[PDB]
Structures are given as structure tokens and as C-alpha cells.
Amino acid sequence: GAMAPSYRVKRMDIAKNDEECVVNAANPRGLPGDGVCKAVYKKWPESFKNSATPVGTAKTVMCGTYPVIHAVGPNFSNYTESEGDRELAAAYREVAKEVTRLGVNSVAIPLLSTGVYSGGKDRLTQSLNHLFTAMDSTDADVVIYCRDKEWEKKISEAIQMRT
Ligand SMILES: [Cl-]
Ligand SMILES: [Cl-]
Ligand SMILES: [Cl-]
Incomplete structure (x- = not known):
């Protein structure tokens, strides 16, 4: 696990991530x-x-x-x-x-x-809160990817509020 598990947000294409694995927002049919x-x-x-x-x-x-x-x-x-x-x-x-x-x-x-x-x-709030509920008990560093400037600010605020 990460030494001090954290949440971060980046506004960029998730295909260019710097993490050990990726989650795809998939459709049921592949x-x-x-x-x-x-x-x-x-x-x-x-x-x-x-x-x-x-x-x-x-x-x-x-x-x-x-x-x-x-x-x-x-x-x-x-x-x-x-x-x-x-x-x-x-x-x-x-x-x-x-x-x-x-x-x-x-x-x-x-x-x-x-x-x-x-x-x-x-x-945004609905999906992010379900992300937190599931990932809070894990010890991986989580990096959330988004594309909108206003969404980046709102996700960053929600992460910082809990620290
Ligand atoms: Cl990009
Ligand atoms: Cl979607
Ligand atoms: Cl977005």
C-alpha cells in the first residue's frame, strides 16, 4: 500500500496517467x-x-x-x-x-x-461520494481524472475539505 494513502485530481486524459493501473468507464458489452x-x-x-x-x-x-x-x-x-x-x-x-x-x-x-x-x-457529487465510500478503506493512492475546469476545482475542493 501507499505510505500515506491520498486522493488527488488531475484535469487531463486518463490514457496518459502515471498510476499502476487504470479504471475504464466501460460499457457492458466490451x-x-x-x-x-x-x-x-x-x-x-x-x-x-x-x-x-x-x-x-x-x-x-x-x-x-x-x-x-x-x-x-x-x-x-x-x-x-x-x-x-x-x-x-x-x-x-x-x-x-x-x-x-x-x-x-x-x-x-x-x-x-x-x-x-x-x-x-x-x-459529480453523487459519483464522487460513491467513489469515496468504496475507496476510503483501501490503501492505494487514488488519482481522479476529469476534463472540465470547473469539475477539477469542485473535485479538488471536496478532497481538501475532508483533510
Ligand atoms: Cl490531455
Ligand atoms: Cl459516462
Ligand atoms: Cl469532467
């Missing part, structure tokens, strides 16, 4: 997709062999020796707010189990269900 998923497909295409997994789960596939944890958040256009909330929390719990199983000291993670699966709603 398709190249859009946004984060498409960037992950371009950088680690080998990790999409048999990566299909249900909503609310995570499935890790190696690209060489680099782990890609495919985490499937719900698409809020299809689920109710209640059911989608439950599946989003479940996907993050499965990411924490995989990060622990892998023995990594750091992990790069995007905010699940905040892009095209958001159902047109701002889900």
Missing part, C-alpha cells in the same frame, strides 16, 4: 464506446479481450502486465434514479475489491456515469 472508454480502447486495446461484464460490476483484463479494470456504471437514461444510484455504488465497490486484489499502490479513476451515461444530469 465495445470501444465513447469518451473515456474510447481513449482507453486506443491506448490499451488488448485489454478488451473478453472484457464484457454486467452493469454494477468490474472485470480486470491485463494489457501486457498493466491492469485495466473495466467498471460498468449504469446509464441513467435507462435506469430509475433509485436503481441507477444502487448500481453506481455497486460498480465502485467492485473497483475497490479489484484494486485490493491486484496489490497496486496507485490507481487512476474517472467519475463513473458522469458523461454520456449521466442522463443529462450533473452527477
Whole structure:
């Protein structure tokens, strides 16, 4: 584990991360997709062999020796707010189990269900709080990746408030 486990946020493409493993914001069918998923497909295409997994789960596939944890958040256009909330929390719990199983000291993670699966709603606080609930008990250094300047400031504020 990391000596003093921390949370950090960076505004840049997760495909350029400096961590020991990456979490993909995957679709259930293991398709190249859009946004984060498409960037992950371009950088680690080998990790999409048999990566299909249900909503609310995570499935890790190696690209060489680099782990890609495919985490499937719900698409809020299809689920109710209640059911989608439950599946989003479940996907993050499965990411924490995989990060622990892998023995990594750091992990790069995007905010699940905040892009095209958001159902047109701002889900920064919802998704980030489920990330914290799952990852708080792990000892890996967590680096959250985002692309929006206002989201970077809000995620950074939420991290600092708890310290
Ligand atoms: Cl970039
Ligand atoms: Cl998304
Ligand atoms: Cl963003």
C-alpha cells in the first residue's frame, strides 16, 4: 500500500496517467464506446479481450502486465434514479475489491456515469461520494481524472475539505 494513502485530481486524459493501473468507464458489452472508454480502447486495446461484464460490476483484463479494470456504471437514461444510484455504488465497490486484489499502490479513476451515461444530469457529487465510500478503506493512492475546469476545482475542493 501507499505510505500515506491520498486522493488527488488531475484535469487531463486518463490514457496518459502515471498510476499502476487504470479504471475504464466501460460499457457492458466490451465495445470501444465513447469518451473515456474510447481513449482507453486506443491506448490499451488488448485489454478488451473478453472484457464484457454486467452493469454494477468490474472485470480486470491485463494489457501486457498493466491492469485495466473495466467498471460498468449504469446509464441513467435507462435506469430509475433509485436503481441507477444502487448500481453506481455497486460498480465502485467492485473497483475497490479489484484494486485490493491486484496489490497496486496507485490507481487512476474517472467519475463513473458522469458523461454520456449521466442522463443529462450533473452527477459529480453523487459519483464522487460513491467513489469515496468504496475507496476510503483501501490503501492505494487514488488519482481522479476529469476534463472540465470547473469539475477539477469542485473535485479538488471536496478532497481538501475532508483533510
Ligand atoms: Cl490531455
Ligand atoms: Cl459516462
Ligand atoms: Cl469532467
